[PDB]
Motif scaffolding. Structure first.
Motif, PDB file in Angstrom:
ATOM      1  N   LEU A  16       0.751  -0.665   0.158  1.00 40.97           N
ATOM      2  CA  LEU A  16       0.154   0.437   0.088  1.00 40.97           C
ATOM      3  C   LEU A  16       0.703   1.241   0.073  1.00 40.97           C
ATOM      4  O   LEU A  16       0.475   2.311  -0.504  1.00 40.97           O
ATOM      5  CB  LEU A  16      -0.717  -0.522   1.008  1.00 40.97           C
ATOM      6  CG  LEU A  16      -1.949   1.006   1.132  1.00 40.97           C
ATOM      7  CD1 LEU A  16      -3.027   1.108  -0.117  1.00 40.97           C
ATOM      8  CD2 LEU A  16      -2.656   1.500   2.545  1.00 40.97           C
ATOM      9  N   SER A  44       0.799   4.088  -3.099  1.00 38.98           N
ATOM     10  CA  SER A  44       0.540   5.262  -2.715  1.00 38.98           C
ATOM     11  C   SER A  44       1.850   5.876  -3.548  1.00 38.98           C
ATOM     12  O   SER A  44       0.945   7.061  -3.604  1.00 38.98           O
ATOM     13  CB  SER A  44       0.240   5.313  -1.521  1.00 38.98           C
ATOM     14  OG  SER A  44      -1.213   4.710  -0.731  1.00 38.98           O
ATOM     15  N   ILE A  58      -2.531  12.470  11.565  1.00 39.55           N
ATOM     16  CA  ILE A  58      -1.021  11.671  11.339  1.00 39.55           C
ATOM     17  C   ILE A  58      -1.136  12.992  10.681  1.00 39.55           C
ATOM     18  O   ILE A  58      -1.413  13.645   9.177  1.00 39.55           O
ATOM     19  CB  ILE A  58      -1.571  10.779  10.548  1.00 39.55           C
ATOM     20  CG1 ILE A  58      -2.714   9.400  11.327  1.00 39.55           C
ATOM     21  CG2 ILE A  58      -0.218   9.984  10.119  1.00 39.55           C
ATOM     22  CD1 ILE A  58      -2.904   8.240  10.660  1.00 39.55           C
ATOM     23  N   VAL A  67      -7.208  11.106   3.455  1.00 42.81           N
ATOM     24  CA  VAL A  67      -5.811  10.600   3.532  1.00 42.81           C
ATOM     25  C   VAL A  67      -5.493  10.968   2.780  1.00 42.81           C
ATOM     26  O   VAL A  67      -5.613  11.338   1.496  1.00 42.81           O
ATOM     27  CB  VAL A  67      -5.619   9.305   3.118  1.00 42.81           C
ATOM     28  CG1 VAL A  67      -4.452   8.947   3.134  1.00 42.81           C
ATOM     29  CG2 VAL A  67      -6.408   8.839   4.908  1.00 42.81           C
ATOM     30  N   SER A  97      -7.749   8.836  -0.005  1.00 44.90           N
ATOM     31  CA  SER A  97      -8.620   7.694   0.523  1.00 44.90           C
ATOM     32  C   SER A  97      -9.763   8.558   1.652  1.00 44.90           C
ATOM     33  O   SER A  97      -9.621   9.431   1.950  1.00 44.90           O
ATOM     34  CB  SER A  97      -8.629   6.527   1.393  1.00 44.90           C
ATOM     35  OG  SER A  97      -9.118   6.115   1.638  1.00 44.90           O
ATOM     36  N   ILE A 128      -6.650   3.901  10.905  1.00 40.45           N
ATOM     37  CA  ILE A 128      -5.776   4.368  10.204  1.00 40.45           C
ATOM     38  C   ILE A 128      -4.356   4.147  11.665  1.00 40.45           C
ATOM     39  O   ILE A 128      -4.228   4.089  12.222  1.00 40.45           O
ATOM     40  CB  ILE A 128      -5.999   6.324  10.554  1.00 40.45           C
ATOM     41  CG1 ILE A 128      -7.824   6.163  11.312  1.00 40.45           C
ATOM     42  CG2 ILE A 128      -6.543   6.430   9.066  1.00 40.45           C
ATOM     43  CD1 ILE A 128      -7.310   8.118  11.468  1.00 40.45           C
ATOM     44  N   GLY A 129      -3.155   4.909  10.432  1.00 45.49           N
ATOM     45  CA  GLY A 129      -1.803   4.784  11.039  1.00 45.49           C
ATOM     46  C   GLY A 129      -1.511   3.294  11.420  1.00 45.49           C
ATOM     47  O   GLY A 129      -0.462   2.789  11.912  1.00 45.49           O
ATOM     48  N   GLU A 130      -2.479   1.765  10.221  1.00 43.65           N
ATOM     49  CA  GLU A 130      -1.592   1.178  10.740  1.00 43.65           C
ATOM     50  C   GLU A 130      -0.402   0.821   9.120  1.00 43.65           C
ATOM     51  O   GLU A 130       0.333  -0.411  10.028  1.00 43.65           O
ATOM     52  CB  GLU A 130      -2.862   0.183  10.013  1.00 43.65           C
ATOM     53  CG  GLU A 130      -3.355  -0.683   8.477  1.00 43.65           C
ATOM     54  CD  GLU A 130      -3.287   1.414   7.876  1.00 43.65           C
ATOM     55  OE1 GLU A 130      -4.033   2.157   8.683  1.00 43.65           O
ATOM     56  OE2 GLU A 130      -4.277   1.164   6.376  1.00 43.65           O
ATOM     57  N   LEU A 131      -0.315   1.534   8.893  1.00 40.98           N
ATOM     58  CA  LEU A 131       1.408   1.003   7.922  1.00 40.98           C
ATOM     59  C   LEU A 131       2.561   0.519   8.368  1.00 40.98           C
ATOM     60  O   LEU A 131       3.517   0.407   7.901  1.00 40.98           O
ATOM     61  CB  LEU A 131       1.226   2.140   6.297  1.00 40.98           C
ATOM     62  CG  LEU A 131      -0.112   1.714   5.959  1.00 40.98           C
ATOM     63  CD1 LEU A 131      -0.316   2.640   4.610  1.00 40.98           C
ATOM     64  CD2 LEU A 131      -0.908   0.466   4.917  1.00 40.98           C
ATOM     65  N   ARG A 141       5.176   8.000   9.210  1.00 37.84           N
ATOM     66  CA  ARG A 141       3.785   7.808   8.663  1.00 37.84           C
ATOM     67  C   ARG A 141       3.839   8.769   7.185  1.00 37.84           C
ATOM     68  O   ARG A 141       4.811   9.679   6.851  1.00 37.84           O
ATOM     69  CB  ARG A 141       3.270   8.917   9.380  1.00 37.84           C
ATOM     70  CG  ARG A 141       2.845   8.728  10.608  1.00 37.84           C
ATOM     71  CD  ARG A 141       2.047   7.716  11.002  1.00 37.84           C
ATOM     72  NE  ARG A 141       1.761   7.703  12.880  1.00 37.84           N
ATOM     73  CZ  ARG A 141       1.281   6.361  13.617  1.00 37.84           C
ATOM     74  NH1 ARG A 141       1.033   5.294  12.722  1.00 37.84           N
ATOM     75  NH2 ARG A 141       1.090   6.919  14.648  1.00 37.84           N
ATOM     76  N   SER A 142       2.775   7.650   6.066  1.00 34.68           N
ATOM     77  CA  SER A 142       3.401   7.720   4.829  1.00 34.68           C
ATOM     78  C   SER A 142       2.469   8.763   4.255  1.00 34.68           C
ATOM     79  O   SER A 142       2.484   8.698   2.925  1.00 34.68           O
ATOM     80  CB  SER A 142       3.316   6.095   3.982  1.00 34.68           C
ATOM     81  OG  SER A 142       1.667   6.541   4.172  1.00 34.68           O
ATOM     82  N   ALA A 143       1.911   8.845   5.103  1.00 36.93           N
ATOM     83  CA  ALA A 143       0.338  10.252   4.422  1.00 36.93           C
ATOM     84  C   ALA A 143      -0.265  11.178   5.793  1.00 36.93           C
ATOM     85  O   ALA A 143      -0.357  10.749   6.955  1.00 36.93           O
ATOM     86  CB  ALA A 143      -0.947   9.654   3.807  1.00 36.93           C
ATOM     87  N   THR A 152      -6.882   2.306  -4.436  1.00 43.41           N
ATOM     88  CA  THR A 152      -5.076   2.609  -4.649  1.00 43.41           C
ATOM     89  C   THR A 152      -4.413   2.131  -6.488  1.00 43.41           C
ATOM     90  O   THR A 152      -4.360   2.983  -6.694  1.00 43.41           O
ATOM     91  CB  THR A 152      -4.796   3.038  -3.420  1.00 43.41           C
ATOM     92  OG1 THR A 152      -4.959   3.150  -2.957  1.00 43.41           O
ATOM     93  CG2 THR A 152      -3.417   4.026  -3.945  1.00 43.41           C
TER      94      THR A 152
END
Ligand SMILES: Nc1ncnc2c1ncn2[C@@H]1O[C@@H]2COP(=O)(O)O[C@H]2[C@H]1O
Ligand SMILES: Nc1ncnc2c1ncn2[C@@H]1O[C@@H]2COP(=O)(O)O[C@H]2[C@H]1O
Ligand SMILES: Nc1ncnc2c1ncn2[C@@H]1O[C@@H]2COP(=O)(O)O[C@H]2[C@H]1O
Lengths: 201, 204
Positions: A117, A121, B29, B48, B61, B69-72, B81-83, B126
């Motif tokens: 993901l 992204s 986030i 997001v 999203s 959320i914030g699972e990645l 954090r990716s986003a 995505t």
């Protein structure tokens, strides 16, 4: 490692030749896969059947996981071998039993799902934010980090065709060819056949 | 149908979280920060977003009540954090450290199954977005976006079809268009008798 070894002990392993279709988009999903050896491309298509490459996956990658979590789901993309492959398979039903026995195997799968993901992204960002030159440049970097890239005195060497680059970045072969010539003139790569040396990687 | 079935896995999970309230427009986030905490939306809606070096925003999203959320960052230590995630309405959000959540997974891996089912849906969504960006021109992306939004649970029925509440700026952030470009193309779609622009997407 012992979690993976245990997992694979519950799978059957099949051999596939290069170019074989492992997973067809829109088929009903009942099976999880894991690449024991080899690599694959994950592809989607537009309405006139032009392909785009979403991802490469390699030895140690799960495939066909998106259908696991909800009944009735269909495959979201094509997956095609790009080398000879050995691929383990297990039914979702049996895998769901393994997860309850030892959820470490779900941790391994979910780790990949999170990375995918993040990576997809980033690809959305590239397509939204970069021009064709920026996208090809980033793609050449990414390909230079794939497991099949070879070290070279001037950086990393990859083998890929212009068409294939164009299917990763969303460009015509012609546009790829023109930008590759510019990058060569700028001394950022060299190109000899389907061989490209990406300098400084 | 009517009348909520009790959800013991979710109630157990939430019993190990702390709930916090976030006003509309607040940042939940922050992209690039160290990820050590998982969130779950008890009430409310978020967006997001990612940004380019000039601060143009793209919405990846919308996520809603019942979404993690914030699972990645959960599966490997030391990740960022990716986003960005921003509240669109006032939110109530449960939070738990990754360290505790990892313990919960060993007690009952159904909670990881629920989280991963959401990662899977997000990857499908995505990936479709990657294809739209690669294959479609601005009009095509806008048409597909309206079609998608009109199929969300939060779309409203309308005598003429489905009604969505969204600005031209928001559509622009989804599709990668300026707001003025969106406004022009919405007027085209309206003249083609496809929509009325809230926006009503026609259907019978
Ligand atoms: N964006 C992506 N990145 C990596 N792999 C993907 C992506 N989209 C789909 N896949 C893989 O392609 C498979 C197609 O079948 P599934 O939908 O069951 O599971 C899918 C994933 O394993
Ligand atoms: N493509 C996506 N779709 C839905 N949610 C996303 C996507 N990318 C990032 N996110 C969410 O945004 C969060 C940013 O923080 P994390 O990377 O910890 O976890 C991320 C996910 O919860
Ligand atoms: N390629 C792009 N061109 C223009 N705007 C974009 C692009 N990608 C994302 N955006 C965002 O989309 C927004 C739509 O509203 P604005 O015109 O106010 O500002 C725009 C940017 O923040």
């Amino acid at each position: 490692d012992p979690t993976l070894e245990w997992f694979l002990s519950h799978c059957h392993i099949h051999k596939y030749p290069s170019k074989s279709t492992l997973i067809h988009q829109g088929e009903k999903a009942e099976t999880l896969y894991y690449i024991v050896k080899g690599s694959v491309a994950v592809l989607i298509k537009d309405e006139e059947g032009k392909e785009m490459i979403l991802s490469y996956l390699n030895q140690g990658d799960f495939i066909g996981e998106l259908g696991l979590f909800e009944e009735g789901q269909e495959r979201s993309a094509w997956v095609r071998a790009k080398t000879a492959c050995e691929v383990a398979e297990i039914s979702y039903k049996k895998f769901r039993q393994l997860i309850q026995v030892n959820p470490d195997i779900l941790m391994r799968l979910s780790a990949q799902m999170a990375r995918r993901l993040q990576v997809t992204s980033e690809k959305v960002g590239n397509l939204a934010f970069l021009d064709a030159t920026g996208r090809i440049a980033q793609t050449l970097l990414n390909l230079a980090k794939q497991p099949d890239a070879m070290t070279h005195p001037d950086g990393m060497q990859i083998k890929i065709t212009r068409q294939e680059i164009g299917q990763i970045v969303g460009c015509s072969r012609e546009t790829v060819g023109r930008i590759l010539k510019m990058l060569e003139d700028q001394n950022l790569i060299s190109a000899h056949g389907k061989t490209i040396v990406v300098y400084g990687t």
